[PDB]
Amino acid sequence: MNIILKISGKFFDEDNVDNLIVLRQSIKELADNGFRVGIVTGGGSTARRYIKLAREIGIGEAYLDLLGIWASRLNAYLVMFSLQDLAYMHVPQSLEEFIQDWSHGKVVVTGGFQPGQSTAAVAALVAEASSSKTLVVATNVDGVYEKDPRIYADVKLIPHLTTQDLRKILEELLDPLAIKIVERSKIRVIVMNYRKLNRIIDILKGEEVSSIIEPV
Amino acid sequence: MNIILKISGKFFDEDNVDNLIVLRQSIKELADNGFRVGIVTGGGSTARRYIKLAREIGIGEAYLDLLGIWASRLNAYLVMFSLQDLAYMHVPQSLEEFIQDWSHGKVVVTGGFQPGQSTAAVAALVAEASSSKTLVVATNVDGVYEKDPRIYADVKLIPHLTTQDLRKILEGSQSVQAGTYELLDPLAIKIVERSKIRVIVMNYRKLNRIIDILKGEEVSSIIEPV
Amino acid sequence: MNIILKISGKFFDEDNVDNLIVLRQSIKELADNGFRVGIVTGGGSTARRYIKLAREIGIGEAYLDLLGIWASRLNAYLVMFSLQDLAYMHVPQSLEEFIQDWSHGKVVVTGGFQPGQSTAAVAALVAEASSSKTLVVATNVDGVYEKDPRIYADVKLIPHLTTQDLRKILEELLDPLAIKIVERSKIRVIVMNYRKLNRIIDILKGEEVSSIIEPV
Amino acid sequence: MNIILKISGKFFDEDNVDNLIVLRQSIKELADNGFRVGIVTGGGSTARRYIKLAREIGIGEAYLDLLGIWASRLNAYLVMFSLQDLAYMHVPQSLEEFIQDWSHGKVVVTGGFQPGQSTAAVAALVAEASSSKTLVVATNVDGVYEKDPRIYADVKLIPHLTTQDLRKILEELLDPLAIKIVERSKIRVIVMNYRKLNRIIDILKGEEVSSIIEPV
Amino acid sequence: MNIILKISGKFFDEDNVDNLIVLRQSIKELADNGFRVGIVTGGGSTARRYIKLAREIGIGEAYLDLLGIWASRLNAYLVMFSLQDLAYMHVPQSLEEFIQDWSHGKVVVTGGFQPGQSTAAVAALVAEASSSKTLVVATNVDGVYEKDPRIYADVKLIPHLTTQDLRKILEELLDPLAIKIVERSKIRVIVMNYRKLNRIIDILKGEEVSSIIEPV
Amino acid sequence: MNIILKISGKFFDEDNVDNLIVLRQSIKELADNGFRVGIVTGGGSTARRYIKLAREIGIGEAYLDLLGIWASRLNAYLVMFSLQDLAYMHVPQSLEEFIQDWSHGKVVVTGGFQPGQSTAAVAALVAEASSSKTLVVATNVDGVYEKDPRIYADVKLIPHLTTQDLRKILELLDPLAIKIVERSKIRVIVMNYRKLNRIIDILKGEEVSSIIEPV
Ligand SMILES: Nc1ncnc2c1ncn2[C@@H]1O[C@H](COP(=O)(O)OP(=O)(O)CP(=O)(O)OP(=O)(O)OC[C@H]2O[C@@H](n3ccc(=O)[nH]c3=O)[C@H](O)[C@@H]2O)[C@@H](O)[C@H]1O
Ligand SMILES: Nc1ncnc2c1ncn2[C@@H]1O[C@H](COP(=O)(O)OP(=O)(O)CP(=O)(O)O)[C@@H](O)[C@H]1O
Ligand SMILES: Nc1ncnc2c1ncn2[C@@H]1O[C@H](COP(=O)(O)OP(=O)(O)CP(=O)(O)O)[C@@H](O)[C@H]1O
Ligand SMILES: Nc1ncnc2c1ncn2[C@@H]1O[C@H](COP(=O)(O)OP(=O)(O)CP(=O)(O)O)[C@@H](O)[C@H]1O
Ligand SMILES: Nc1ncnc2c1ncn2[C@@H]1O[C@H](COP(=O)(O)OP(=O)(O)CP(=O)(O)O)[C@@H](O)[C@H]1O
Ligand SMILES: Nc1ncnc2c1ncn2[C@@H]1O[C@H](COP(=O)(O)OP(=O)(O)CP(=O)(O)O)[C@@H](O)[C@H]1O
Ligand SMILES: O=c1ccn([C@@H]2O[C@H](COP(=O)(O)O)[C@@H](O)[C@H]2O)c(=O)[nH]1
Ligand SMILES: O=c1ccn([C@@H]2O[C@H](COP(=O)(O)O)[C@@H](O)[C@H]2O)c(=O)[nH]1
Ligand SMILES: O=c1ccn([C@@H]2O[C@H](COP(=O)(O)O)[C@@H](O)[C@H]2O)c(=O)[nH]1
Ligand SMILES: O=c1ccn([C@@H]2O[C@H](COP(=O)(O)O)[C@@H](O)[C@H]2O)c(=O)[nH]1
Ligand SMILES: O=c1ccn([C@@H]2O[C@H](COP(=O)(O)O)[C@@H](O)[C@H]2O)c(=O)[nH]1
Ligand SMILES: [Co+2]
Ligand SMILES: [Co+2]
Ligand SMILES: [Co+2]
Ligand SMILES: [Co+2]
Ligand SMILES: [Co+2]
Ligand SMILES: [Co+2]
Ligand SMILES: [Mg+2]
Ligand SMILES: [Mg+2]
């Protein structure tokens, strides 16, 4: 079974050894349970700092996105280096390169690809290219809520929903490209807290707090 | 300053020497008028044919898009080879590669980059990266109409509109499938809006009048970013 | 052991799903019988079409050949994508790249390399580099005929011959570089109909209609 | 002439629009005065943060250096993007790539190359490969002091010294590779405060506060 | 006007900087006279030393050619490094890469490309791709002779001949691919002594001992 | 376990078949004993020859090193081609590329990377990146001596020493090589390449060699 894990950039902002460790464990563990794993890393606050500074000097939007992409790639190298023998030792820069890299039978870690999208879209593209039926989005909230839970207090986690529900809820988590891709290739998305990465197998069994998004 | 020309795949389906001859001429005329030019080529019926066959054997959507991309790149090599000394002799395979290639001060010709988008999105990205204020979409209709002019008769060509208008004209008509025919896709519109790029939709049959079109003195549609 | 299969461009001109299905099937068959397979695809009518148009506008012969090479590569991607996990996911652009790609232990699919030759020469080069003792040319024709079966009716098939017989017959199929390479490295060439890709194992035993060309 | 500017990673830690801006004008100015410019960017606090976290999870020293190198490249992209038409739009990853990139006649911006050295060593190697006779180290101090001015109060700036003096002062500013290279190729090094980049032409004339290091 | 210059590997066997100095001189002579120059270097005795040793341990013919190609590339780097600012600083490894490298408007130096041919064939391909109407073969003999002048003593130089004559004379210098290419693209070939490289302009004007081969 | 074997350029200057056949058999000996092997080849006399000529025409030091690097790469291709199926068929040009190449589970053969260092420094970098605990330097001398045995008569072989001893002796291994083996605690064995036939015995400490302990 092939699975893709998107790791929120916020995971890297914590500057917390435990995050990396728990991720390392989780990949080792998925492997032992017969999964091939691809990982996509977000840009986080590093991306936002570089983007903000570049924007203030008039750097255009393409190049701003590219700085965000390089920040995401820095996080990809960190993860890749933490996996040593498990991972193919190259961070692909495009979907085309990911396909080549995935051919080596090992874990592949990637950052961004192209301006105008997020790393959630990259995770979807990479899930599609690897025939992964499940994309896990490991982020800093427990699942999908009615509204953004870091604005709105007492908002309820939605354990099971569709991509058409999600679109309405979102009007970052998943961008338009990500949703288009998971819909056309019928990829199931699980949104979970990265804190619960130590419990990843239980989440895939549906035993633990998460949101499951069905493609329609 | 800089301009991007998207050339519809349908231009290549015609298999006509005059098409290439006239594109070639227009580029020279743009250069001689002080423009740097980037060119994006569509995949056309070659793309569709490969996509259809691959889809019949169960090949997934990512790989279908890639076949479409490789068909577009074949057209890009044709165009690039027709330009000889004017062009940097490399077809970039990503936006990042385009930026590097654009650095050589010559014409750059590209095809597709990534699954889930069209060559119009590529042309928008490449316009954004080259600080082109104008993207020209040279296609097999004279401009933008209220509805598809190859489906609906005596709809009127819309000479000047906004991206908001275009979004409504094109809304609800587009499939997520590899090989879908589009004018401008969602990524293309997002990009031209965020970077304030004006889009001119014209017939490639009038590439011989490319300067007059830029001056607003020939049949075309001008789309203003909002 | 290692075998190279050249697939005529005419195979791709048929725009027939059943062809790909049998190629796919014939390669899994070879793998299951202990063969490592490399595949070279021809440019076919797409190549001739681009070449003709480019030639009309005065494009030089190097660039015409390159357009034919890119058309061949488009067919290589199609075949590579049809093989999914069996193939290393990269189409090598040179013999040097083929050697690197072959190092991954998987099926490698290539198109052309260099102006002034055909994809048959590429297949020979790739046979030589992979220590393949046999090169199979799967074409639109049953074998080597006394002359061109496209043009002449009732001409007969030569089940067996040498590389100088072939040169004399030819002065398509195999070009000068292809013959020089198979002669210097003593590679046997089997010419067969791509329809018969199903009996590829029977053809290799010598138990189906084909022409075997011995290197001298 | 050709000149190389090393920009301390501390320049990027300031998260200050002013810094990038003043650097932008300095290259434009150097260009207008007939200089070809190469730029090498340090990794700064981003590099330190990634290295510290990776070290805590047992990542080996090669990979720690590589994280520092990727952080320095992120800063190189920022600078390169700020220069737009003036710069060749590729960040070289080795000295060999730098030499190819430098061939385009434009500004080249680089980060790190190889574990076991600093970006000062990169700036030296790049100065040597570009036949630059002057390397400017633009850092967060006015020049070379008797001892580290960020530690030792009341220490005096040394306006003119040799590479053997510097070696004794240091026993990072310049590492062993950097010193070896500037000695063997007789490259003069100017240490200056990056805050005075606005005044860069006056520094090259010797008419502003700086330290000039002569190769011996 | 574009011209290609093939420099015999024997030029590099001589182990003398006077040869490089004259070649270097020759290229400035050509540039200053309005020529764009491409250079192809032979492998010489280094290639022969590696091929012989590899052949003794049973290394196959593809790989023997590749060792010869790498030897030719070492000579290409030497020449390219001797040209400094005049040359684009990349040695292309294929015809496709040459075309990209030629796009920079500078001198391009190459070695070999592909097994089964010589550097003369490379020079022809590169002449064809650069629209060069003249290929100069600078070798250790004054021109073309009625037979190999190092094997049969006292034979006459042929100052003016055709490619059909040459193919009869040769039944080294130019291989079958080289001849096919210069014929199809109508490229004139001048065979000269590399000792007379100082007098390339006079040779191009037909005022110095050489053989001119006309394509038929 | 992972091991790196640095082969002196002098090995390639000798021009005899046995050398290659006997390197070839060692790695197959090492592989069969459970080792993953990386190999770094020196530039030898080919390097010095190109360097000397280029230096005479005024070519700068960066480009002289690069010519030496290309000569080392030519030796790497020779070795790689002699190993056939055992090796990943790419010579990496940087430490970054080596790491990617090493990911294929096969033998990787490298030459130089970067001006200002030697192929011994490459071997140390590559040992560090592959988590090799042992770097073998197979050279034209039996081990480490109190001083250069070519330049000095009657000197003795030191069977066991530290990296701090070695840098006093050298005032084989360059400064980057020593820094890297010290920071990553890599043991270096210096041996004669003529004894590549008894490489397993050398690793067990059962033949003539010098072992250098990192301090
Ligand atoms: N209102 C209105 N007014 C005027 N015309 C309209 C209107 N509404 C519809 N139309 C119609 O648009 C048509 C013009 O569209 P056209 O010029 O052909 O542009 P197209 O792009 O569709 C053809 P084309 O120019 O051939 O190229 P594409 O198809 O982009 O690319 C091929 C294929 O490759 C894939 N791909 C490509 C690039 C990339 O980065 N990623 C990718 O995945 C993807 O699967 C692609 O499908 C025209 O005939 C009208 O009838
Ligand atoms: N309906 C909803 N339910 C849950 N979370 C929502 C939401 N709407 C918005 N969010 C927000 O989505 C955020 C997660 O996005 P995520 O951080 O994983 O993407 P990312 O990797 O792009 C972040 P970065 O920009 O830092 O890389 C949450 O922190 C939450 O505030
Ligand atoms: N004596 C002979 N015996 C058999 N076939 C012959 C022949 N002489 C010429 N041919 C022709 O050679 C063709 C086979 O060549 P093939 O099509 O395999 O090469 P290719 O892949 O280069 C074609 P494309 O240019 O379409 O890619 C047959 O269709 C046949 O007409
Ligand atoms: N004798 C001396 N004179 C001046 N500065 C000295 C010094 N000895 C040490 N330094 C220190 O050198 C520092 C500058 O090094 P620099 O910041 O240029 O290297 P770098 O780019 O490697 C830093 P980073 O690790 O942030 O990238 C100063 O901040 C100063 O504290
Ligand atoms: N008919 C003929 N006229 C002149 N020279 C001939 C010849 N037939 C053979 N030769 C030989 O060809 C040699 C020139 O070949 P050249 O050295 O240019 O090719 P090359 O670069 O392949 C040599 P290397 O293999 O050393 O690189 C001469 O030394 C000469 O002895
Ligand atoms: N104390 C010492 N003990 C042993 N050898 C010493 C030495 N000091 C210097 N050397 C010299 O170093 C040589 C070994 O260097 P080695 O050949 O391993 O490096 P290398 O591969 O860079 C050579 P090349 O430059 O030819 O490729 C010995 O033959 C010896 O001459
Ligand atoms: O393929 C990608 C991935 C990321 N980004 C940019 O990099 C930032 C960091 O990624 P993320 O963590 O926000 O998804 C994004 O906000 C966006 O600007 C892209 O442009 N394209
Ligand atoms: O290595 C190659 C392979 C193909 N071709 C060109 O591509 C066309 C397609 O190959 P084939 O299928 O015709 O052999 C050929 O006619 C030829 O022009 C080359 O120049 N070199
Ligand atoms: O070529 C280089 C450049 C940088 N670094 C690493 O990246 C850090 C950031 O560069 P600097 O700003 O410290 O020079 C260094 O301390 C060092 O760990 C290297 O290993 N090699
Ligand atoms: O494209 C090339 C160039 C060179 N060689 C090989 O390298 C040797 C050196 O080239 P030359 O100087 O003999 O032409 C040749 O004998 C030949 O084996 C090739 O195989 N292909
Ligand atoms: O990483 C390397 C490897 C080699 N060399 C150069 O190549 C020569 C040949 O390598 P070696 O065999 O001396 O180690 C060296 O003297 C040196 O000039 C380098 O500059 N860097
Ligand atoms: Co985000
Ligand atoms: Co370039
Ligand atoms: Co053909
Ligand atoms: Co530092
Ligand atoms: Co690989
Ligand atoms: Co040495
Ligand atoms: Mg379309
Ligand atoms: Mg020869």
mmCIF file of N, CA, C and O in Angstrom, chain A residues 12 15-17 20-21 24 46 49-50 53-54 56-57 59 63 66-67 70-71 74-75 77-78 81-82 84, chain D residues 12 15-17 20-21 24 46 49-50 53-54 56-57 59 63 66-67 70 74-75 77-78 81-82 84:
data_model
loop_
_atom_site.group_PDB
_atom_site.id
_atom_site.type_symbol
_atom_site.label_atom_id
_atom_site.label_comp_id
_atom_site.label_asym_id
_atom_site.label_seq_id
_atom_site.Cartn_x
_atom_site.Cartn_y
_atom_site.Cartn_z
ATOM 1 N N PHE A 12 7.510 22.205 11.956
ATOM 2 C CA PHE A 12 8.910 22.615 11.945
ATOM 3 C C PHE A 12 9.162 23.913 12.714
ATOM 4 O O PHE A 12 10.267 24.148 13.151
ATOM 5 N N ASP A 15 10.318 23.742 16.549
ATOM 6 C CA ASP A 15 11.722 23.592 16.861
ATOM 7 C C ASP A 15 11.842 22.627 18.061
ATOM 8 O O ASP A 15 12.500 22.888 19.093
ATOM 9 N N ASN A 16 11.157 21.499 17.881
ATOM 10 C CA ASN A 16 10.955 20.524 18.914
ATOM 11 C C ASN A 16 11.412 19.178 18.403
ATOM 12 O O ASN A 16 10.831 18.623 17.451
ATOM 13 N N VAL A 17 12.442 18.664 19.064
ATOM 14 C CA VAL A 17 13.026 17.369 18.739
ATOM 15 C C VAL A 17 11.970 16.250 18.676
ATOM 16 O O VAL A 17 12.028 15.375 17.831
ATOM 17 N N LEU A 20 10.190 15.638 15.305
ATOM 18 C CA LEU A 20 11.016 14.871 14.357
ATOM 19 C C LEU A 20 11.077 13.412 14.725
ATOM 20 O O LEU A 20 10.882 12.549 13.898
ATOM 21 N N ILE A 21 11.351 13.165 16.002
ATOM 22 C CA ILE A 21 11.426 11.808 16.543
ATOM 23 C C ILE A 21 10.137 11.038 16.277
ATOM 24 O O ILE A 21 10.179 9.935 15.739
ATOM 25 N N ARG A 24 9.851 10.269 12.642
ATOM 26 C CA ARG A 24 10.783 9.188 12.337
ATOM 27 C C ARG A 24 10.173 7.834 12.694
ATOM 28 O O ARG A 24 10.067 6.962 11.842
ATOM 29 N N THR A 46 9.477 29.953 8.519
ATOM 30 C CA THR A 46 10.619 30.289 7.671
ATOM 31 C C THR A 46 10.160 30.799 6.305
ATOM 32 O O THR A 46 10.612 31.827 5.857
ATOM 33 N N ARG A 49 8.531 34.307 6.810
ATOM 34 C CA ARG A 49 9.533 35.368 7.041
ATOM 35 C C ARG A 49 10.232 35.802 5.719
ATOM 36 O O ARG A 49 10.360 37.013 5.442
ATOM 37 N N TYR A 50 10.666 34.820 4.918
ATOM 38 C CA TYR A 50 11.343 35.138 3.652
ATOM 39 C C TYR A 50 10.416 35.825 2.653
ATOM 40 O O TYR A 50 10.816 36.786 1.995
ATOM 41 N N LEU A 53 9.709 39.604 3.910
ATOM 42 C CA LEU A 53 10.878 40.455 3.606
ATOM 43 C C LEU A 53 11.054 40.720 2.092
ATOM 44 O O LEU A 53 11.311 41.851 1.685
ATOM 45 N N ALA A 54 10.902 39.672 1.285
ATOM 46 C CA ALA A 54 11.025 39.812 -0.151
ATOM 47 C C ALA A 54 9.903 40.707 -0.714
ATOM 48 O O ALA A 54 10.145 41.537 -1.577
ATOM 49 N N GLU A 56 8.381 43.149 0.837
ATOM 50 C CA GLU A 56 8.688 44.530 1.237
ATOM 51 C C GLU A 56 9.717 45.243 0.321
ATOM 52 O O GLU A 56 9.783 46.484 0.287
ATOM 53 N N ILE A 57 10.514 44.477 -0.414
ATOM 54 C CA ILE A 57 11.405 45.068 -1.382
ATOM 55 C C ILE A 57 10.912 44.943 -2.809
ATOM 56 O O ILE A 57 11.661 45.219 -3.740
ATOM 57 N N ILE A 59 9.703 42.276 -4.531
ATOM 58 C CA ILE A 59 9.922 41.046 -5.292
ATOM 59 C C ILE A 59 8.567 40.463 -5.714
ATOM 60 O O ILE A 59 7.636 40.402 -4.931
ATOM 61 N N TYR A 63 8.470 34.743 -7.461
ATOM 62 C CA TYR A 63 9.693 34.611 -6.702
ATOM 63 C C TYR A 63 9.419 34.488 -5.218
ATOM 64 O O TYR A 63 10.147 33.774 -4.549
ATOM 65 N N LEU A 66 8.557 30.977 -4.821
ATOM 66 C CA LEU A 66 9.791 30.212 -4.903
ATOM 67 C C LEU A 66 10.606 30.203 -3.622
ATOM 68 O O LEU A 66 11.202 29.192 -3.306
ATOM 69 N N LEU A 67 10.633 31.332 -2.916
ATOM 70 C CA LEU A 67 11.242 31.403 -1.602
ATOM 71 C C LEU A 67 10.517 30.481 -0.604
ATOM 72 O O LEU A 67 11.178 29.828 0.213
ATOM 73 N N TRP A 70 11.615 26.986 -1.462
ATOM 74 C CA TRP A 70 12.942 26.662 -0.927
ATOM 75 C C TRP A 70 12.929 26.419 0.606
ATOM 76 O O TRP A 70 13.585 25.518 1.068
ATOM 77 N N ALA A 71 12.138 27.197 1.339
ATOM 78 C CA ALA A 71 11.916 26.963 2.752
ATOM 79 C C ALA A 71 11.321 25.575 3.016
ATOM 80 O O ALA A 71 11.778 24.872 3.915
ATOM 81 N N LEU A 74 14.054 22.947 2.570
ATOM 82 C CA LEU A 74 14.900 22.887 3.735
ATOM 83 C C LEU A 74 14.332 21.938 4.789
ATOM 84 O O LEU A 74 15.078 21.142 5.352
ATOM 85 N N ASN A 75 13.021 22.021 5.029
ATOM 86 C CA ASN A 75 12.333 21.068 5.912
ATOM 87 C C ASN A 75 12.339 19.647 5.377
ATOM 88 O O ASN A 75 12.507 18.728 6.138
ATOM 89 N N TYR A 77 14.778 18.307 3.490
ATOM 90 C CA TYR A 77 16.119 17.799 3.760
ATOM 91 C C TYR A 77 16.294 17.360 5.214
ATOM 92 O O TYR A 77 16.867 16.327 5.480
ATOM 93 N N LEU A 78 15.794 18.160 6.138
ATOM 94 C CA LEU A 78 15.831 17.805 7.563
ATOM 95 C C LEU A 78 15.182 16.450 7.820
ATOM 96 O O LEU A 78 15.778 15.578 8.437
ATOM 97 N N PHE A 81 17.166 13.601 6.017
ATOM 98 C CA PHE A 81 18.384 13.285 6.742
ATOM 99 C C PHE A 81 18.092 12.514 8.034
ATOM 100 O O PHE A 81 18.903 11.720 8.453
ATOM 101 N N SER A 82 16.930 12.744 8.639
ATOM 102 C CA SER A 82 16.533 11.997 9.828
ATOM 103 C C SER A 82 16.164 10.539 9.521
ATOM 104 O O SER A 82 16.112 9.723 10.421
ATOM 105 N N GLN A 84 17.787 8.623 7.074
ATOM 106 C CA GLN A 84 19.042 7.953 6.606
ATOM 107 C C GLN A 84 18.918 6.812 5.620
ATOM 108 O O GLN A 84 18.940 7.063 4.425
ATOM 109 N N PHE D 12 21.237 38.465 7.188
ATOM 110 C CA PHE D 12 19.900 37.899 6.929
ATOM 111 C C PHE D 12 19.091 37.697 8.208
ATOM 112 O O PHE D 12 17.871 37.688 8.175
ATOM 113 N N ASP D 15 16.402 40.507 9.450
ATOM 114 C CA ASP D 15 15.030 40.546 8.969
ATOM 115 C C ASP D 15 14.638 42.024 8.689
ATOM 116 O O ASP D 15 13.572 42.550 9.088
ATOM 117 N N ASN D 16 15.561 42.673 7.990
ATOM 118 C CA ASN D 16 15.538 44.085 7.763
ATOM 119 C C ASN D 16 15.516 44.320 6.269
ATOM 120 O O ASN D 16 16.403 43.874 5.545
ATOM 121 N N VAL D 17 14.478 45.001 5.814
ATOM 122 C CA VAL D 17 14.377 45.411 4.407
ATOM 123 C C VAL D 17 15.652 46.187 3.991
ATOM 124 O O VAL D 17 16.231 45.940 2.937
ATOM 125 N N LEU D 20 18.815 44.241 2.559
ATOM 126 C CA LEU D 20 18.699 43.753 1.178
ATOM 127 C C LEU D 20 18.802 44.923 0.215
ATOM 128 O O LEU D 20 19.527 44.882 -0.772
ATOM 129 N N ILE D 21 18.051 45.968 0.530
ATOM 130 C CA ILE D 21 18.021 47.171 -0.316
ATOM 131 C C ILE D 21 19.414 47.735 -0.566
ATOM 132 O O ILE D 21 19.801 47.980 -1.702
ATOM 133 N N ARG D 24 21.393 45.515 -2.743
ATOM 134 C CA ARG D 24 20.935 45.717 -4.116
ATOM 135 C C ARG D 24 21.656 46.910 -4.784
ATOM 136 O O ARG D 24 22.244 46.773 -5.844
ATOM 137 N N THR D 46 19.235 30.776 10.774
ATOM 138 C CA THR D 46 18.512 29.655 10.178
ATOM 139 C C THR D 46 19.377 28.406 10.121
ATOM 140 O O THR D 46 18.943 27.322 10.524
ATOM 141 N N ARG D 49 19.900 27.087 13.733
ATOM 142 C CA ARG D 49 18.694 26.432 14.246
ATOM 143 C C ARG D 49 18.465 25.023 13.654
ATOM 144 O O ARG D 49 18.172 24.073 14.396
ATOM 145 N N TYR D 50 18.617 24.869 12.339
ATOM 146 C CA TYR D 50 18.485 23.550 11.719
ATOM 147 C C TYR D 50 19.570 22.573 12.170
ATOM 148 O O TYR D 50 19.294 21.403 12.414
ATOM 149 N N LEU D 53 18.868 21.452 15.996
ATOM 150 C CA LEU D 53 17.797 20.465 16.022
ATOM 151 C C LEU D 53 18.205 19.097 15.439
ATOM 152 O O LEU D 53 17.917 18.051 16.019
ATOM 153 N N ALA D 54 18.869 19.111 14.294
ATOM 154 C CA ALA D 54 19.322 17.880 13.680
ATOM 155 C C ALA D 54 20.355 17.158 14.566
ATOM 156 O O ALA D 54 20.313 15.946 14.690
ATOM 157 N N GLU D 56 20.571 17.286 17.817
ATOM 158 C CA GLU D 56 19.826 16.703 18.950
ATOM 159 C C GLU D 56 19.194 15.337 18.662
ATOM 160 O O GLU D 56 18.977 14.546 19.589
ATOM 161 N N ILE D 57 18.911 15.045 17.394
ATOM 162 C CA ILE D 57 18.373 13.745 17.040
ATOM 163 C C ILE D 57 19.401 12.796 16.459
ATOM 164 O O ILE D 57 19.035 11.762 15.903
ATOM 165 N N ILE D 59 21.782 13.304 14.065
ATOM 166 C CA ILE D 59 22.168 13.410 12.656
ATOM 167 C C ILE D 59 23.662 13.721 12.557
ATOM 168 O O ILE D 59 24.155 14.606 13.222
ATOM 169 N N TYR D 63 25.695 15.784 7.327
ATOM 170 C CA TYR D 63 24.310 16.195 7.089
ATOM 171 C C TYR D 63 23.974 17.467 7.818
ATOM 172 O O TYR D 63 23.229 18.302 7.316
ATOM 173 N N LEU D 66 25.322 19.981 5.573
ATOM 174 C CA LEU D 66 24.399 20.113 4.430
ATOM 175 C C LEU D 66 23.161 20.949 4.724
ATOM 176 O O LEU D 66 22.741 21.719 3.876
ATOM 177 N N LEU D 67 22.604 20.829 5.934
ATOM 178 C CA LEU D 67 21.531 21.702 6.367
ATOM 179 C C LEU D 67 21.954 23.167 6.423
ATOM 180 O O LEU D 67 21.174 24.072 6.049
ATOM 181 N N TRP D 70 22.118 24.291 2.810
ATOM 182 C CA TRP D 70 20.785 24.626 2.303
ATOM 183 C C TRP D 70 20.222 25.927 2.862
ATOM 184 O O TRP D 70 19.586 26.654 2.141
ATOM 185 N N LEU D 74 19.136 29.308 0.626
ATOM 186 C CA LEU D 74 17.916 30.059 0.782
ATOM 187 C C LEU D 74 18.194 31.558 0.779
ATOM 188 O O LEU D 74 17.491 32.328 0.112
ATOM 189 N N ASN D 75 19.220 31.974 1.513
ATOM 190 C CA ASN D 75 19.646 33.368 1.472
ATOM 191 C C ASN D 75 20.177 33.810 0.092
ATOM 192 O O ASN D 75 19.954 34.963 -0.302
ATOM 193 N N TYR D 77 19.091 32.589 -2.809
ATOM 194 C CA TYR D 77 17.896 32.800 -3.640
ATOM 195 C C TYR D 77 17.254 34.137 -3.375
ATOM 196 O O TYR D 77 16.903 34.833 -4.314
ATOM 197 N N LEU D 78 17.158 34.511 -2.113
ATOM 198 C CA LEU D 78 16.615 35.826 -1.746
ATOM 199 C C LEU D 78 17.370 36.973 -2.429
ATOM 200 O O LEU D 78 16.769 37.836 -3.039
ATOM 201 N N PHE D 81 16.964 36.819 -6.308
ATOM 202 C CA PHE D 81 15.653 37.303 -6.700
ATOM 203 C C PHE D 81 15.548 38.812 -6.575
ATOM 204 O O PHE D 81 14.840 39.424 -7.336
ATOM 205 N N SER D 82 16.263 39.404 -5.624
ATOM 206 C CA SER D 82 16.269 40.852 -5.459
ATOM 207 C C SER D 82 17.007 41.561 -6.589
ATOM 208 O O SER D 82 16.792 42.745 -6.809
ATOM 209 N N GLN D 84 17.063 40.418 -9.897
ATOM 210 C CA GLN D 84 16.300 40.209 -11.156
ATOM 211 C C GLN D 84 17.170 40.194 -12.390
ATOM 212 O O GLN D 84 17.885 39.235 -12.575
#
